[PDB]
Amino acid sequence: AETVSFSWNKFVPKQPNMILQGDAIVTSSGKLQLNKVDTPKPSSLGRALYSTPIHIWDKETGSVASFAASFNFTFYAPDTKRLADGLAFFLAPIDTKPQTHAGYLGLFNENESGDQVVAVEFDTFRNSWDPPNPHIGINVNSIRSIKTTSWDLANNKVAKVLITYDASTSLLVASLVYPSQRTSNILSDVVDLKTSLPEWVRIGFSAATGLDIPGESHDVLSWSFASNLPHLDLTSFVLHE
Amino acid sequence: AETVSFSWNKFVPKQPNMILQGDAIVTSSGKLQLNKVDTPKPSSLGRALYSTPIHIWDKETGSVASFAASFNFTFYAPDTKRLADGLAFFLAPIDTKPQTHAGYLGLFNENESGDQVVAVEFDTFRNSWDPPNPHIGINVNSIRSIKTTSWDLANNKVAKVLITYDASTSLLVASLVYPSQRTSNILSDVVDLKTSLPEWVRIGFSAATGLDIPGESHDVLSWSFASNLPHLDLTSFVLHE
Amino acid sequence: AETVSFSWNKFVPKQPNMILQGDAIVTSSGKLQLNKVDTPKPSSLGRALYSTPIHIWDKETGSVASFAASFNFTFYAPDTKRLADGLAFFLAPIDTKPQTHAGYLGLFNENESGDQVVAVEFDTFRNSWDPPNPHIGINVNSIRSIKTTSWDLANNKVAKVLITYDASTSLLVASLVYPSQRTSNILSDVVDLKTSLPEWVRIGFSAATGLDIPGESHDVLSWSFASNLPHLDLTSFVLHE
Amino acid sequence: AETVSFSWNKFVPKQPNMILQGDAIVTSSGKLQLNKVDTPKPSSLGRALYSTPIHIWDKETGSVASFAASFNFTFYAPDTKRLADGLAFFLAPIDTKPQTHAGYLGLFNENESGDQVVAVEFDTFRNSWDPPNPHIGINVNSIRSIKTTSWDLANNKVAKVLITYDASTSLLVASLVYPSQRTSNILSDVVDLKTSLPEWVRIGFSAATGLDIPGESHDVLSWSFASNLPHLDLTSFVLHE
Numbered sequence A, B, C, D: 001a002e003t004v005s006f007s008w009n010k011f012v013p014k015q016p017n018m019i020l021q022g023d024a025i026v027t028s029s030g031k032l033q034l035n036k037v038d039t040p041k042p043s044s045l046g047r048a049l050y051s052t053p054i055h056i057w058d059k060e061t062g063s064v065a066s067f068a069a070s071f072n073f074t075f076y077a078p079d080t081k082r083l084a085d086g087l088a089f090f091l092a093p094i095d096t097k098p099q100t101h102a103g104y105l106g107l108f109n110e111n112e113s114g115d116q117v118v119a120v121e122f123d124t125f126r127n128s129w130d131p132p133n134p135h136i137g138i139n140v141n142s143i144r145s146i147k148t149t150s151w152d153l154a155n156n157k158v159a160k161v162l163i164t165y166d167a168s169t170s171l172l173v174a175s176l177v178y179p180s181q182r183t184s185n186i187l188s189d190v191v192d193l194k195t196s197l198p199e200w201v202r203i204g205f206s207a208a209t210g211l212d213i214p215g216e217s218h219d220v221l222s223w224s225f226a227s228n229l230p231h232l233d234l235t236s237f238v239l240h241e
């Protein structure tokens, strides 16, 4: 089997194994700051991508990879009543570039069909296509999630996320936990990677502040990822990676 | 650090690394059948325990272990309207023996304070101390869960469970997923192992059928476990173990 | 190609080409009354099925049928503030029988995985798994719709519905129109019949009144259906059938 | 009853049953290209008309026809931010000729009252009389739609449209679906053909590129039509025609 994995308890400035786009920068304090601040600046868009391409599925053997990703993130909203727009974990073509900001989370464009992009969003603003209240959603080539669930978020608190994909069942699972609040949310749905993503892809984060309002800033504090493409043990990744 | 882990996609009869109690037996088909059947027989109680003792916390260093466990289980109810009693994953003293059946899931006794037993239950019957509807609960030395959440169960379908404990935050998280139903449930709460469990313990399963009604049978199909006691990477355990 | 179709501007009592289940009866006025009245009686469940089995897909050739169905229905709610539960158009195994009432619309059962049943619902009551406000949803083997959209309903007014399935794109489309209100709603999503339904099935309607409240009654006034299983022209069905 | 209908999965060059006006031509690939390209050329106007006149309503009997039309179309915009002007399906007097281009979609003229022309537009540019954002509208003798609704369009994707008219209710319904996006839009309103169209008319398409900008090109890929003038079954037309 073909496998890859990595784990960081923090980020380091100028680290050559990461690609930054938009307003994203890593602070000296080891934080991946996706949006500009001075309080969030409106219309800010930043994305970060793990430099090395991941082999998601193979056209020959036809086998698809299973993977797991976890990270700690937080947002700061100067006004918890006017939140916007959100954060997303995504997989996309190797040459992926930033797209439309605000409600499109920098992954899609209005009037166009999305590229081969798959993502798990943490949406804070209700756009026309959205359900009411902040939510977690699974996006498959569209900003219009195929499924969502309410997200009990907390301003300034660290959220711990775990995203897992089981190739055997094609099931994608996303769970979010707030240790300090002992609160938790989970979502799951089947996704077919063979028809929604190219064989090789890059993974990363994308976040956007309000279009005309500060909304909230987004910071990723740590990141862990493991993938196994067959010719798995998640308990070892949640306790290991 | 001190570490231990194991992973099985199935069970084998007479396997010397497991301790069976009650009516529990492993079929030739590789299934850990916890309750007697002929349809579930009432008042049946079976438990299985991983033979090797786990070092959960150390009195000297004072450090506590982090761990992860996953398994696939299912129940069969000849009548989905009269379910009883449930299944539980637990940690207990090395010399742990079966206790009261039915509503006590074989872990506790009426009129007595529970031993140093910590468990995650999948409760199908509403006893006096229970909330309404099947649920997932975190039990700490008591059959009366410190916290619970509704469990959208499905008869005869395989449920995939992931239980994780983070020593740094003392947070215990339990999630259950039904691939075929794309349905999911999650629960979390802080638990202090130092004051609710001895340094060394054994882990296993316990299930009970109705006291005077068949209720449902319980079968565990696979099992995976990893523990790390410091002087972790879960992504590697969900994809590895 | 294998084809079948039928069209009725009204129902006739004792018509031998229809199967009635539950409280469903056809009035002398030519109406298919699915629920008992005296104002709707609580806990009423009725279903009607076209007697002849439809060949939906073929295991050999692997081809799947395209079909179209239209009908006029209405509900009467003595109190438009307490509506429950809804109406559904469905396809199911030939020997399909009524299931759980109320929120389950007589198609599914609590604690069990749905049979091979596909349906388009017109939901008036918000159950735990439902989104807010009356809606139209596409159910695939589950009472939990894979997709929904708000339904601007009107008490006592006749709604004209058109459901179409295109085998070439696997897309299921449902549209509802209120001539008198010049109001309209539409929904669409892909559904794979090969994996959610048996080769042969029966089609019909199912409606349920509130569990403990009258809710509203449901009457189907006309019905039209056409199917084409390849080794289509919908314009001819909306103007013909 | 008097009836007529036709159905094409593609167009053939020089086909004698169609009338082309403006820049409209049919490619060798079977596409009805309404606008000149080289990317769309600004100020381009093309129209196509089914050669045979349709009997819409009869002055004697006073009866009005019911009809259904469907087609697949697409537009290509080199810049999805500067779209213009749109496409329309229309009914007009037998001797109908092209009118003003750009925002008038070649159907109307500035400073003049429209002839007896009825149309369903797919408007991409906001003119003074328009609502904001691309939309679908019902035009009755005027470029100023009597009703509209937002149109979630996608560049380069094939849209499947279904327009139906019910003489019994005088209701005109237009629905548009994007299979690849599982997205859908619908609109409806009453229209009185007797007072807005002559007894006999010709039907066709009309599209216009931006006045001073390329905007987008418009191609119709297939076309189906059925009409019934009484002294209907649409399910047969969506699955048949």
Ligand SMILES: CC(=O)N[C@H]1[C@H](O[C@@H]2[C@@H](O[C@@H]3O[C@H](CO)[C@@H](O[C@@H]4O[C@H](CO)[C@H](O)[C@H](O)[C@H]4O)[C@H](O)[C@H]3NC(C)=O)[C@@H](O)[C@@H](CO)O[C@H]2O)O[C@H](CO)[C@@H](O[C@@H]2O[C@H](CO)[C@H](O)[C@H](O)[C@H]2O)[C@@H]1O
Pocket: A084, A085, A102, A103, A104, A125, A127, A209, A210, A211, A212, A213, D132
């Ligand atoms: C952003 C923008 O261009 N606004 C112009 C505004 O546009 C009207 C529409 O309103 C805007 O719609 C946006 C949806 O795309 C919405 O963005 C959302 O923002 C939230 C954060 O609040 C969040 O990020 C979300 O994800 C975003 O989608 C905007 O909030 C919203 N703007 C407002 C003020 O509500 C919409 O109403 C539409 C419906 O018909 O009409 C559009 O016109 O239009 C105004 C004027 O009408 C325009 O303001 C003018 O700008 C000029 C310069 O461009 C001059 O400065 C002029 O003085 C000023 O009035 C906005 O620029």
Ligand SMILES: CC(=O)N[C@H]1[C@H](O[C@@H]2[C@@H](O[C@@H]3O[C@H](CO)[C@@H](O[C@@H]4O[C@H](CO)[C@H](O)[C@H](O)[C@H]4O)[C@H](O)[C@H]3NC(C)=O)[C@@H](O)[C@@H](CO)O[C@H]2O)O[C@H](CO)[C@@H](O[C@@H]2O[C@H](CO)[C@H](O)[C@H](O)[C@H]2O)[C@@H]1O
Pocket: B084, B085, B102, B103, B104, B125, B127, B209, B210, B211, B212, B213
């Ligand atoms: C189990 C038992 O001993 N029942 C005797 C019964 O006891 C009365 C109490 O009823 C029982 O309460 C149990 C709670 O501990 C309950 O168990 C639950 O069972 C469900 C499955 O259904 C599930 O597993 C759950 O987790 C369990 O807790 C029993 O279901 C319930 N039994 C019934 C029939 O409801 C309770 O009502 C209490 C309140 O005051 O009174 C107790 O007396 O009492 C009956 C007689 O009253 C006794 O039956 C007699 O048994 C004799 C032999 O022992 C003779 O056979 C006699 O003919 C017969 O009537 C039950 O044995």
Ligand SMILES: CC(=O)N[C@H]1[C@H](O[C@@H]2[C@@H](O[C@@H]3O[C@H](CO)[C@@H](O[C@@H]4O[C@H](CO)[C@H](O)[C@H](O)[C@H]4O)[C@H](O)[C@H]3NC(C)=O)[C@@H](O)[C@@H](CO)O[C@H]2O)O[C@H](CO)[C@@H](O[C@@H]2O[C@H](CO)[C@H](O)[C@H](O)[C@H]2O)[C@@H]1O
Pocket: B132, C084, C085, C102, C103, C104, C125, C127, C209, C210, C211, C212, C213
């Ligand atoms: C229906 C029923 O059995 N109700 C008993 C009630 O149950 C509690 C639960 O409440 C009920 O939950 C139903 C969900 O399955 C809900 O049904 C929905 O009804 C609406 C129409 O309103 C719609 O159709 C929808 O689709 C349905 O799902 C009921 O409306 C709801 N009932 C009420 C009154 O709100 C729920 O609250 C649950 C949470 O813990 O607890 C259940 O216990 O429980 C009461 C007593 O608690 C019971 O009433 C008793 O019945 C006895 C006979 O069985 C005696 O008559 C006794 O005097 C009486 O109090 C209901 O029968």
Ligand SMILES: CC(=O)N[C@H]1[C@H](O[C@@H]2[C@@H](O[C@@H]3O[C@H](CO)[C@@H](O[C@@H]4O[C@H](CO)[C@H](O)[C@H](O)[C@H]4O)[C@H](O)[C@H]3NC(C)=O)[C@@H](O)[C@@H](CO)O[C@H]2O)O[C@H](CO)[C@@H](O[C@@H]2O[C@H](CO)[C@H](O)[C@H](O)[C@H]2O)[C@@H]1O
Pocket: D084, D085, D102, D103, D104, D125, D127, D209, D210, D211, D212, D213
């Ligand atoms: C098209 C035209 O004749 N433009 C002359 C321009 O006219 C002024 C008006 O502006 C134009 O208004 C059009 C509305 O009918 C608008 O058309 C829309 O185009 C979009 C695509 O972008 C879409 O198709 C939509 O459906 C159409 O309706 C034009 O876009 C718009 N043109 C511009 C540049 O914005 C309008 O502003 C009006 C308000 O008072 O004033 C009119 O004058 O006027 C300019 C000069 O003012 C003229 O340009 C001159 O042309 C001369 C030759 O005729 C010479 O070349 C000279 O050098 C040049 O400046 C435009 O021809």
Ligand SMILES: *[C@@H]1O[C@H](CO)[C@@H](O[C@@H]2O[C@H](CO)[C@@H](O)[C@H](O)[C@H]2NC(C)=O)[C@H](O)[C@H]1NC(C)=O
Pocket: A009, A010, A029, A030, A031, A071, A072, A158, A160, A179, A221, A222, B169
């Ligand atoms: C989520 O990850 C972040 C990043 O490692 C953790 O925050 C760091 O925790 C250490 C504790 O050893 C502190 O010294 C650092 O200052 C923290 N970094 C930042 C940027 O705050 C955090 O503990 C993790 N949270 C959870 C719940 O696991």
Ligand SMILES: *[C@@H]1O[C@H](CO)[C@@H](O[C@@H]2O[C@H](CO)[C@@H](O)[C@H](O)[C@H]2NC(C)=O)[C@H](O)[C@H]1NC(C)=O
Pocket: A169, B009, B010, B029, B030, B031, B071, B072, B158, B160, B179, B221, B222
């Ligand atoms: C949960 O674990 C069980 C046990 O391994 C899995 O069931 C086995 O799946 C294999 C597929 O390779 C079958 O050949 C065996 O017959 C199954 N065993 C039994 C006892 O049924 C199951 O696939 C796992 N489920 C999920 C969702 O991962």
Ligand SMILES: *[C@@H]1O[C@H](CO)[C@@H](O[C@@H]2O[C@H](CO)[C@@H](O)[C@H](O)[C@H]2NC(C)=O)[C@H](O)[C@H]1NC(C)=O
Pocket: C009, C010, C029, C030, C031, C071, C072, C158, C160, C179, C221, C222, D169
């Ligand atoms: C929907 O179908 C019903 C059933 O045919 C139509 O209602 C009948 O309309 C005729 C008109 O010729 C009346 O004479 C009957 O009394 C009606 N039947 C009933 C039970 O009311 C109705 O017109 C159709 N509605 C639409 C919008 O097409």
Ligand SMILES: *[C@@H]1O[C@H](CO)[C@@H](O[C@@H]2O[C@H](CO)[C@@H](O)[C@H](O)[C@H]2NC(C)=O)[C@H](O)[C@H]1NC(C)=O
Pocket: C169, D009, D010, D029, D030, D031, D071, D072, D158, D160, D179, D221, D222
């Ligand atoms: C809409 O109609 C067009 C025209 O027939 C369809 O496109 C053709 O589809 C066939 C598939 O058998 C291809 O071989 C042709 O190359 C296509 N023609 C063109 C010009 O592209 C299209 O499939 C239809 N779309 C939907 C959703 O029904």
Ligand SMILES: [Ca+2]
Pocket: A085, A086, A103, A123, A124, A125, A126, A127, A130
């Ligand atoms: Ca949003």
Ligand SMILES: [Ca+2]
Pocket: B085, B086, B103, B123, B124, B125, B126, B127, B130
């Ligand atoms: Ca219990």
Ligand SMILES: [Ca+2]
Pocket: C085, C086, C103, C123, C124, C125, C126, C127, C130
């Ligand atoms: Ca409901």
Ligand SMILES: [Ca+2]
Pocket: D085, D086, D103, D123, D124, D125, D126, D127, D130
């Ligand atoms: Ca316009």
Ligand SMILES: [Mn+2]
Pocket: A121, A123, A130, A131, A137, A143, A145
């Ligand atoms: Mn969203």
Ligand SMILES: [Mn+2]
Pocket: B121, B123, B130, B131, B137, B143, B145
């Ligand atoms: Mn319990």
Ligand SMILES: [Mn+2]
Pocket: C121, C123, C130, C131, C137, C143, C145
């Ligand atoms: Mn519903």
Ligand SMILES: [Mn+2]
Pocket: D121, D123, D130, D131, D137, D143, D145
């Ligand atoms: Mn317009």
